[PDB]
Amino acid sequence: TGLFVTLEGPESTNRDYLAERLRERGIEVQLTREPGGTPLAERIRELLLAPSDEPMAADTELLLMFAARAQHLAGVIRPALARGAVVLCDRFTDATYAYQGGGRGLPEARIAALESFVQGDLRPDLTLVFDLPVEIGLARAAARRLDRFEQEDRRFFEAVRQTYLQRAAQAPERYQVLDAGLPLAEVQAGLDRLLPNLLERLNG
Amino acid sequence: TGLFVTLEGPEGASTNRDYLAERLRERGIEVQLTREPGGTPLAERIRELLLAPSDEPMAADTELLLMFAARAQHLAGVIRPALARGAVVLCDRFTDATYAYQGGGRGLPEARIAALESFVQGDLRPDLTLVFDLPVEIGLARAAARGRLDRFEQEDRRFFEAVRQTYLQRAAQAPERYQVLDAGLPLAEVQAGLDRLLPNLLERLN
Ligand SMILES: Cc1cn([C@H]2C[C@H](O)[C@@H](COP(=O)(O)O)O2)c(=O)[nH]c1=O
Ligand SMILES: Cc1cn([C@H]2C[C@H](O)[C@@H](COP(=O)(O)O)O2)c(=O)[nH]c1=O
Ligand SMILES: [Ca+2]
Ligand SMILES: [Ca+2]
Ligand SMILES: [Ca+2]
């Protein structure tokens, strides 16, 4: 039956730390990320992130995101959950609501229609939102060539951050919001702290 | 304004699209020629993913969504703008092929294809769809004559028979927007079958 956990936030050792703590307990952990997660899904990821002179329609972006999600769900996520694993997935449909919804301005109802179409009843059991002011995360990206999303403006990323926060506030039972700026030791302490509940979810 | 015409049929083999175009151009009509999946740089990249054989099985939902992603890009970038300027769009393959290949061939429910059709296209449908019907064997041989078989061309005989039957069923349910042409006739009988077709086209335009 497993547990489907997703990790979200604006633009790594967090997931690894959580994975190590779970494995120590004999729990199988499947690490993955979106868009991507399978060879085909990664090829779709490439098209989505590559800058181009041709404008990508909002609907195209949304449909490609969901095409990669369908492949990833079928190939990686569902099988893992069927083995009883905890899936730790970097980004999922919350990112679609934030980026394609908040950022692009596509209506929530249309994103929800595809969510249902692609996922059926399946939703993450828990979503960890690593929150951070937009400028700091874009500077982090700027510090390492920016892809199609990374090169968007302030309005865009502010919509992204606030969409994440609003969805978490609306269904607090499904989310935990963390401050992604804390000292490493203090981040890990927060990860330790959320672990008992994660295990209660799995064993529930 | 404008007119949206799609050209469909069983797998196999461009010539007719380019021909009808000539009859229309000589009348002073603007014609925009195109094809799916593809039609734009990104849509062509999506075509390449869809056609490339792989040892990873592509989920049916993935195939359907990539097909409609390319369609969405193509509609926004090519089709709607052309119709807006009053051009005739002549498009090799469109959503009928989704019903035939993803529905008939893959076995995806018609309802799910229709859901995405409405999602992507809203109310928009082709004004006229020409189905170039032909025994499956002939078309497959044309497609196989040269080059490597792509993801679809690698399929089995039953898959392509299902494709053909779906096209015929759909056309028979809406005779007003479909014309079925025998692609297994002498070029003269089919070029002239296309000739006998122009007056209807031109009228649909005006
Ligand atoms: C999963 C997902 C990611 N994205 C974006 C966020 C990132 O800018 C980009 C690549 O993700 P990444 O930053 O974690 O590597 O994909 C969406 O726009 N919608 C989605 O549904
Ligand atoms: C437009 C479209 C094409 N196809 C397939 C049929 C062909 O095998 C393939 C390439 O088209 P083509 O043979 O005309 O070059 O695309 C679908 O499966 N669904 C669709 O919606
Ligand atoms: Ca990024
Ligand atoms: Ca060939
Ligand atoms: Ca072919």
Coordinates of C-alpha atoms and ligand atoms in Angstrom, one line a residue:
Chain A
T1 CA 0.0 0.0 0.0
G2 CA 3.0 2.2 0.6
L3 CA 3.2 6.0 1.0
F4 CA 3.3 8.7 -1.7
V5 CA 5.3 11.7 -0.5
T6 CA 6.1 14.7 -2.7
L7 CA 8.6 17.5 -2.2
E8 CA 7.8 21.0 -3.6
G9 CA 9.2 24.5 -3.4
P10 CA 10.6 27.4 -5.6
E11 CA 13.7 27.1 -7.9
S12 CA 18.6 18.0 -2.4
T13 CA 20.1 16.6 0.8
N14 CA 16.6 17.0 2.2
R15 CA 15.3 14.0 0.3
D16 CA 18.4 12.0 0.9
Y17 CA 18.3 12.6 4.6
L18 CA 14.7 11.5 4.8
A19 CA 15.5 8.4 2.7
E20 CA 18.3 7.4 4.9
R21 CA 16.1 7.7 8.0
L22 CA 13.4 5.5 6.5
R23 CA 15.8 2.9 5.2
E24 CA 17.3 2.5 8.6
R25 CA 13.9 1.3 9.6
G26 CA 13.7 -1.4 6.9
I27 CA 11.4 0.7 4.8
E28 CA 11.9 0.5 1.0
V29 CA 12.3 4.0 -0.5
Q30 CA 11.8 4.9 -4.2
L31 CA 13.5 8.2 -5.1
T32 CA 12.2 10.0 -8.2
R33 CA 11.4 13.4 -9.7
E34 CA 9.1 15.3 -12.2
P35 CA 9.0 16.0 -15.0
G36 CA 11.0 12.9 -15.7
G37 CA 11.5 9.6 -13.8
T38 CA 11.7 7.3 -16.8
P39 CA 13.7 7.5 -20.1
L40 CA 10.6 8.8 -22.1
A41 CA 9.5 11.1 -19.3
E42 CA 13.0 12.5 -19.2
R43 CA 12.9 13.2 -23.0
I44 CA 9.6 15.0 -22.3
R45 CA 11.3 17.0 -19.5
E46 CA 14.0 18.0 -22.1
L47 CA 11.4 19.5 -24.4
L48 CA 9.7 21.3 -21.5
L49 CA 12.9 22.9 -20.2
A50 CA 14.6 23.9 -23.4
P51 CA 14.4 27.6 -24.4
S52 CA 13.1 28.2 -27.9
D53 CA 12.2 31.1 -30.1
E54 CA 8.8 29.5 -30.7
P55 CA 6.4 30.3 -27.9
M56 CA 4.9 27.2 -26.2
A57 CA 1.2 27.5 -25.7
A58 CA 0.0 27.2 -22.1
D59 CA -2.2 24.2 -23.0
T60 CA 0.8 22.5 -24.7
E61 CA 2.9 22.9 -21.5
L62 CA 0.2 21.6 -19.4
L63 CA -0.4 18.6 -21.6
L64 CA 3.3 17.7 -21.9
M65 CA 3.6 18.0 -18.1
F66 CA 0.7 15.5 -17.7
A67 CA 2.0 13.2 -20.5
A68 CA 5.3 12.8 -18.5
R69 CA 3.2 12.3 -15.3
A70 CA 1.2 9.5 -16.9
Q71 CA 4.3 7.6 -18.0
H72 CA 6.0 8.2 -14.6
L73 CA 2.9 7.1 -12.6
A74 CA 2.6 3.9 -14.6
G75 CA 6.3 3.0 -14.8
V76 CA 7.6 4.1 -11.4
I77 CA 5.1 5.4 -8.8
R78 CA 2.3 2.9 -8.9
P79 CA 4.6 -0.2 -9.0
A80 CA 6.7 1.2 -6.0
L81 CA 3.5 1.9 -4.0
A82 CA 2.4 -1.7 -4.8
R83 CA 5.6 -3.0 -3.3
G84 CA 4.8 -1.1 -0.1
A85 CA 7.6 1.5 -0.7
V86 CA 7.7 5.1 0.4
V87 CA 8.0 7.2 -2.7
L88 CA 9.9 10.4 -2.3
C89 CA 9.1 12.4 -5.4
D90 CA 10.6 15.8 -6.2
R91 CA 7.7 17.8 -7.6
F92 CA 4.3 16.6 -8.7
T93 CA 0.8 18.0 -9.4
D94 CA 1.1 20.7 -6.8
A95 CA 3.9 22.2 -9.0
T96 CA 1.4 22.1 -11.9
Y97 CA -1.1 24.2 -9.9
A98 CA 1.6 26.6 -8.9
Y99 CA 3.5 26.9 -12.3
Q100 CA 0.8 26.3 -14.9
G101 CA -1.9 27.7 -12.7
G102 CA -0.4 30.5 -10.7
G103 CA 2.4 31.2 -13.2
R104 CA 0.7 30.7 -16.6
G105 CA -2.8 31.6 -15.4
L106 CA -4.6 28.4 -16.5
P107 CA -7.8 27.9 -14.5
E108 CA -7.7 25.5 -11.6
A109 CA -10.7 23.6 -13.0
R110 CA -8.7 22.7 -16.2
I111 CA -5.7 21.5 -14.2
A112 CA -8.0 19.5 -12.0
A113 CA -9.7 17.9 -15.1
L114 CA -6.3 16.5 -16.2
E115 CA -5.3 15.6 -12.6
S116 CA -8.4 13.3 -12.6
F117 CA -7.9 12.2 -16.1
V118 CA -4.3 11.1 -15.5
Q119 CA -4.3 10.0 -11.9
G120 CA -7.8 8.7 -11.3
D121 CA -8.2 8.8 -7.5
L122 CA -4.4 8.8 -6.7
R123 CA -3.0 11.8 -4.8
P124 CA 0.1 12.3 -2.7
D125 CA -0.4 11.3 0.9
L126 CA 1.9 14.0 2.1
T127 CA 3.5 17.0 0.5
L128 CA 6.5 18.8 1.9
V129 CA 6.7 22.5 0.9
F130 CA 10.2 23.9 1.3
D131 CA 9.4 27.6 1.3
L132 CA 11.8 30.4 0.4
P133 CA 11.5 34.0 -0.8
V134 CA 11.5 34.0 -4.6
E135 CA 14.6 36.2 -5.1
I136 CA 16.9 33.9 -3.1
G137 CA 16.0 30.8 -5.0
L138 CA 16.3 32.5 -8.4
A139 CA 19.7 33.7 -7.3
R140 CA 20.6 30.1 -6.5
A141 CA 19.6 29.2 -10.1
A142 CA 21.4 32.3 -11.5
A143 CA 24.6 31.3 -9.7
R144 CA 24.8 28.0 -11.6
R145 CA 22.3 28.7 -17.9
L146 CA 18.6 29.3 -17.0
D147 CA 16.0 27.1 -18.6
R148 CA 12.5 28.0 -19.9
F149 CA 11.0 28.3 -16.4
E150 CA 13.9 29.7 -14.5
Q151 CA 14.0 32.8 -16.8
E152 CA 10.5 33.9 -16.0
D153 CA 9.8 37.2 -14.2
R154 CA 9.1 38.2 -10.5
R155 CA 5.3 38.2 -11.0
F156 CA 5.6 34.6 -12.3
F157 CA 7.5 33.3 -9.4
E158 CA 5.6 35.2 -6.8
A159 CA 2.5 33.6 -8.1
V160 CA 4.3 30.2 -7.8
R161 CA 5.2 30.7 -4.2
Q162 CA 1.9 32.0 -3.1
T163 CA 0.0 29.2 -4.9
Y164 CA 2.0 26.7 -2.9
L165 CA 1.3 28.5 0.4
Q166 CA -2.4 28.9 -0.3
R167 CA -2.9 25.2 -1.2
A168 CA -1.1 24.1 1.9
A169 CA -3.1 26.5 4.1
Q170 CA -6.3 25.2 2.5
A171 CA -5.6 21.5 3.3
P172 CA -3.2 21.5 6.2
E173 CA -3.7 17.8 6.8
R174 CA -1.9 17.0 3.5
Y175 CA 1.0 19.5 3.7
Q176 CA 3.9 20.5 5.9
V177 CA 5.5 23.9 5.2
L178 CA 9.2 24.2 6.0
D179 CA 11.6 27.1 6.0
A180 CA 14.3 26.2 3.4
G181 CA 16.7 28.8 4.7
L182 CA 17.5 27.3 8.1
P183 CA 21.0 26.1 9.1
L184 CA 21.7 22.5 7.9
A185 CA 21.5 21.2 11.5
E186 CA 18.2 23.0 12.0
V187 CA 16.7 21.7 8.7
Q188 CA 17.6 18.1 9.6
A189 CA 16.0 18.6 13.1
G190 CA 12.8 19.6 11.3
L191 CA 13.1 16.5 9.1
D192 CA 13.6 14.3 12.2
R193 CA 10.5 16.0 13.7
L194 CA 8.1 15.2 10.9
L195 CA 9.3 11.6 10.7
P196 CA 7.0 10.1 13.4
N197 CA 3.9 11.4 11.5
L198 CA 5.3 10.1 8.2
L199 CA 5.5 6.7 9.8
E200 CA 2.0 7.0 11.3
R201 CA 0.8 7.7 7.8
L202 CA 2.6 4.7 6.4
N203 CA 1.5 2.3 9.1
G204 CA -2.0 3.7 9.2
Chain B
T1 CA -14.1 32.3 -41.8
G2 CA -11.6 30.0 -43.6
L3 CA -12.1 26.3 -44.0
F4 CA -10.6 23.4 -42.1
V5 CA -10.1 20.2 -44.1
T6 CA -8.4 17.1 -42.9
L7 CA -7.0 14.2 -44.9
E8 CA -7.2 10.8 -43.2
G9 CA -7.1 7.1 -43.9
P10 CA -5.5 3.7 -43.1
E11 CA -1.7 3.6 -42.5
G12 CA -0.1 4.4 -45.9
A13 CA 1.5 5.7 -47.7
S14 CA 0.9 14.1 -49.1
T15 CA 0.3 14.0 -52.9
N16 CA -3.5 14.7 -52.7
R17 CA -3.1 17.4 -50.1
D18 CA -0.6 19.1 -52.4
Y19 CA -2.9 18.5 -55.4
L20 CA -6.1 19.9 -53.9
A21 CA -4.0 22.8 -52.9
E22 CA -3.2 23.5 -56.6
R23 CA -6.9 23.5 -57.6
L24 CA -7.6 25.9 -54.8
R25 CA -4.6 28.2 -55.4
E26 CA -5.5 28.7 -59.0
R27 CA -8.8 30.1 -57.8
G28 CA -7.1 32.7 -55.8
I29 CA -7.6 31.0 -52.4
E30 CA -4.9 31.0 -49.7
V31 CA -4.0 27.5 -48.7
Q32 CA -2.1 26.5 -45.6
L33 CA -0.7 22.9 -45.8
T34 CA 0.2 21.0 -42.7
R35 CA 0.3 17.6 -40.9
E36 CA -0.1 15.9 -37.5
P37 CA 1.6 15.1 -35.3
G38 CA 3.8 18.1 -36.1
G39 CA 3.3 21.3 -38.0
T40 CA 5.5 23.5 -35.8
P41 CA 9.1 23.1 -34.5
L42 CA 8.0 21.9 -31.1
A43 CA 5.1 19.8 -32.5
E44 CA 7.7 18.2 -34.8
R45 CA 9.9 17.3 -31.8
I46 CA 6.9 15.8 -30.2
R47 CA 6.2 13.7 -33.4
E48 CA 9.8 12.4 -33.1
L49 CA 9.2 11.1 -29.6
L50 CA 5.9 9.5 -30.6
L51 CA 7.4 7.7 -33.7
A52 CA 10.7 6.6 -32.2
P53 CA 10.8 2.9 -31.3
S54 CA 11.9 2.2 -27.7
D55 CA 12.3 -0.8 -25.4
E56 CA 10.3 1.3 -22.8
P57 CA 6.6 0.7 -23.2
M58 CA 4.8 4.0 -23.8
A59 CA 1.6 4.1 -21.6
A60 CA -1.5 4.6 -23.6
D61 CA -2.3 7.7 -21.7
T62 CA 1.2 9.1 -22.5
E63 CA 0.7 8.4 -26.2
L64 CA -2.7 10.1 -26.1
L65 CA -1.5 13.1 -24.2
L66 CA 1.6 13.7 -26.4
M67 CA -0.7 13.5 -29.4
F68 CA -2.9 16.1 -28.0
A69 CA 0.0 18.3 -26.8
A70 CA 1.3 18.5 -30.3
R71 CA -2.3 19.2 -31.5
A72 CA -2.6 22.0 -29.0
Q73 CA 0.6 23.7 -30.2
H74 CA -0.3 23.2 -33.8
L75 CA -3.8 24.6 -33.3
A76 CA -2.5 27.8 -31.6
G77 CA 0.5 28.3 -33.9
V78 CA -0.9 27.4 -37.3
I79 CA -4.5 26.2 -37.7
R80 CA -6.4 28.9 -35.9
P81 CA -4.3 31.8 -37.3
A82 CA -4.8 30.4 -40.8
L83 CA -8.6 30.1 -40.4
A84 CA -8.6 33.6 -39.0
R85 CA -7.2 35.0 -42.2
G86 CA -9.7 33.0 -44.2
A87 CA -7.3 30.5 -45.6
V88 CA -8.2 26.9 -46.4
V89 CA -6.2 24.6 -44.1
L90 CA -5.4 21.2 -45.6
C91 CA -4.1 19.0 -42.8
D92 CA -2.7 15.5 -43.2
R93 CA -4.2 13.7 -40.1
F94 CA -6.0 15.1 -37.1
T95 CA -8.3 13.8 -34.3
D96 CA -10.0 11.2 -36.4
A97 CA -6.6 9.5 -36.5
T98 CA -6.7 9.6 -32.7
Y99 CA -10.0 7.8 -32.6
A100 CA -8.7 5.3 -35.2
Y101 CA -5.2 4.6 -33.9
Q102 CA -5.5 5.3 -30.1
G103 CA -9.1 4.2 -30.0
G104 CA -9.4 1.4 -32.6
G105 CA -5.8 0.2 -32.6
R106 CA -4.8 0.7 -28.9
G107 CA -8.3 0.2 -27.5
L108 CA -8.6 3.4 -25.5
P109 CA -12.2 4.2 -24.8
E110 CA -13.8 6.6 -27.2
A111 CA -15.1 8.6 -24.2
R112 CA -11.5 9.4 -23.0
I113 CA -10.4 10.6 -26.5
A114 CA -13.6 12.7 -26.7
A115 CA -12.8 14.3 -23.3
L116 CA -9.4 15.4 -24.6
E117 CA -10.8 16.5 -27.9
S118 CA -13.1 18.9 -26.2
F119 CA -10.4 20.0 -23.7
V120 CA -8.0 20.9 -26.5
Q121 CA -10.3 22.0 -29.3
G122 CA -13.3 23.4 -27.5
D123 CA -16.0 23.5 -30.2
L124 CA -13.6 23.4 -33.2
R125 CA -13.9 20.4 -35.6
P126 CA -12.8 20.0 -39.2
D127 CA -15.4 21.4 -41.7
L128 CA -14.7 18.4 -44.0
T129 CA -12.7 15.2 -43.6
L130 CA -11.6 13.2 -46.6
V131 CA -11.0 9.5 -45.8
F132 CA -8.8 7.8 -48.3
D133 CA -9.9 4.3 -47.9
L134 CA -7.8 1.4 -49.0
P135 CA -7.2 -2.3 -48.2
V136 CA -4.9 -2.5 -45.2
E137 CA -2.3 -4.6 -47.0
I138 CA -1.8 -2.0 -49.8
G139 CA -1.2 0.9 -47.4
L140 CA 1.1 -1.1 -45.1
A141 CA 3.2 -2.0 -48.1
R142 CA 3.5 1.6 -49.1
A143 CA 4.5 2.6 -45.6
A144 CA 7.0 -0.3 -45.5
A145 CA 8.5 0.2 -49.0
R146 CA 11.5 2.0 -47.5
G147 CA 13.2 3.2 -44.3
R148 CA 12.9 1.8 -40.8
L149 CA 9.4 1.0 -39.5
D150 CA 8.5 3.6 -36.8
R151 CA 6.6 2.8 -33.6
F152 CA 3.2 2.6 -35.3
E153 CA 4.4 1.0 -38.6
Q154 CA 5.7 -1.9 -36.4
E155 CA 2.2 -2.8 -35.3
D156 CA 0.5 -6.1 -36.2
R157 CA -2.0 -6.7 -38.9
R158 CA -5.0 -6.6 -36.6
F159 CA -4.1 -3.2 -35.3
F160 CA -4.1 -1.8 -38.8
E161 CA -7.4 -3.5 -39.7
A162 CA -8.9 -1.9 -36.6
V163 CA -7.6 1.4 -37.7
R164 CA -9.3 1.1 -41.1
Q165 CA -12.7 0.0 -39.7
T166 CA -12.8 2.8 -37.1
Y167 CA -12.3 5.4 -39.9
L168 CA -15.2 3.9 -41.8
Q169 CA -17.5 3.6 -38.8
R170 CA -16.9 7.2 -37.9
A171 CA -17.5 8.5 -41.4
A172 CA -20.7 6.5 -41.7
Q173 CA -22.0 8.2 -38.5
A174 CA -21.6 11.7 -39.9
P175 CA -21.9 11.7 -43.8
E176 CA -22.2 15.5 -43.8
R177 CA -18.6 16.1 -42.7
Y178 CA -16.9 13.1 -44.3
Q179 CA -16.3 11.9 -47.8
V180 CA -14.8 8.5 -48.3
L181 CA -12.6 8.1 -51.4
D182 CA -11.3 4.9 -52.9
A183 CA -7.6 5.4 -52.7
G184 CA -7.2 2.1 -54.6
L185 CA -8.4 3.6 -57.9
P186 CA -6.4 4.9 -60.9
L187 CA -5.0 8.4 -60.2
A188 CA -7.3 9.7 -62.9
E189 CA -10.4 8.4 -61.1
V190 CA -9.2 9.8 -57.8
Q191 CA -7.8 13.1 -59.0
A192 CA -11.2 13.5 -60.7
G193 CA -12.9 12.3 -57.5
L194 CA -11.1 15.3 -56.0
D195 CA -12.2 17.4 -58.9
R196 CA -15.9 16.5 -58.3
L197 CA -15.1 17.6 -54.7
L198 CA -14.1 21.2 -55.3
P199 CA -17.6 22.7 -55.8
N200 CA -18.6 21.4 -52.4
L201 CA -15.4 22.7 -50.8
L202 CA -15.7 26.1 -52.5
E203 CA -19.3 26.4 -51.3
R204 CA -18.3 25.4 -47.8
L205 CA -15.8 28.2 -47.9
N206 CA -18.3 30.8 -48.9
Ligands
LIG1 C1 6.5 18.8 -11.9 C2 6.4 20.1 -12.5 C3 7.5 20.9 -12.7 N1 7.5 22.2 -13.3 C4 8.8 22.9 -13.5 C5 9.4 23.5 -12.2 C6 10.8 23.7 -12.6 O1 11.0 25.0 -13.1 C7 11.0 22.7 -13.8 C8 12.1 21.7 -13.5 O2 11.9 21.2 -12.2 P1 13.1 21.3 -11.2 O3 13.4 22.7 -10.8 O4 12.9 20.7 -9.9 O5 14.4 20.7 -11.7 O6 9.8 22.1 -14.0 C9 6.2 22.7 -13.7 O7 6.2 23.9 -14.3 N2 5.0 22.0 -13.6 C10 5.1 20.7 -13.0 O8 4.0 20.1 -12.8
LIG2 C1 -2.5 12.6 -36.1 C2 -2.3 11.2 -35.5 C3 -1.3 10.4 -36.1 N1 -1.1 9.1 -35.6 C4 -0.1 8.2 -36.3 C5 -0.5 7.5 -37.5 C6 0.8 7.3 -38.2 O1 1.3 6.0 -37.9 C7 1.8 8.3 -37.6 C8 2.5 9.2 -38.6 O2 1.6 9.7 -39.5 P1 1.9 9.4 -41.0 O3 1.9 8.0 -41.4 O4 0.9 10.1 -41.9 O5 3.3 10.0 -41.4 O6 1.0 9.0 -36.7 C9 -1.8 8.6 -34.5 O7 -1.5 7.5 -34.0 N2 -2.7 9.4 -33.8 C10 -3.0 10.7 -34.3 O8 -3.8 11.4 -33.7
CA3 CA 14.9 24.6 -11.8
CA4 CA 8.5 4.2 -45.0
CA5 CA 3.5 6.2 -41.5

